Every structure is written in C-alpha cells, then in structure tokens.
C-alpha cells in the first residue's frame, strides 16, 4: 500500500513456512519474493 | 528439519516442572504449534484444561 519495500530476516524457520503461514492472510508473499518488492534470508 | 525433509509430521512431549511452558524454557520457541495441558485444583477439584 505504502510503496516502501522491505527485507525479512529469520533465524529459527524456512522461508517457506513464512510463505505458508502467511497464505492464509491472502498477503500472498511468494509474489512480492519472486516480484524483488519483498526479500528473505534465512540464518 | 530431517523429519520435515521427509515428509513427517513430528509431536514432541516436554515437561514444564517449576515453572514456564517448558523445562529448558525455550523448546517452545523452536516448535511449529505449542498446545499446554493442565490438571489444575481448584478449591478442591480438578478441572483438566487444555490450551493452544
């Protein structure tokens, strides 16, 4: 909404189970992961 | 992570003790679904509660 993209960084899960959980919202990450409007990194 | 590689779903038991959700402590916060059982008295009687 705002245009402001952003970067997630996670220390204890996947990326995918972020992706999954977030499914349910209809936030629809995948998108914006493959889209460049939204970035992960798992640690 | 091997389980979840192989296509399992895992249920682990924990014991709490003293105190917390846990007896470490922190087993909680590398878990998917945390679900607490409880056999509190009160009063005098025993109600069994569960809670995710």
Known sequence: ?43 | DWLKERGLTTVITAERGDGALTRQGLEEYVSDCVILLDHRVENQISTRRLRI
Not at chain 1, 5 to 29: C, K, M, Q, W, Y
């Open chain 1, 1 to 43: 909404d705002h245009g402001e993209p952003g970067v997630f960084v996670t220390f204890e899960e996947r990326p995918e189970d972020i992706v999954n959980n977030v499914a349910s919202l209809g936030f629809e990450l995948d998108k914006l992961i493959e889209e460049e409007k939204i970035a992960i990194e798992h640690i």
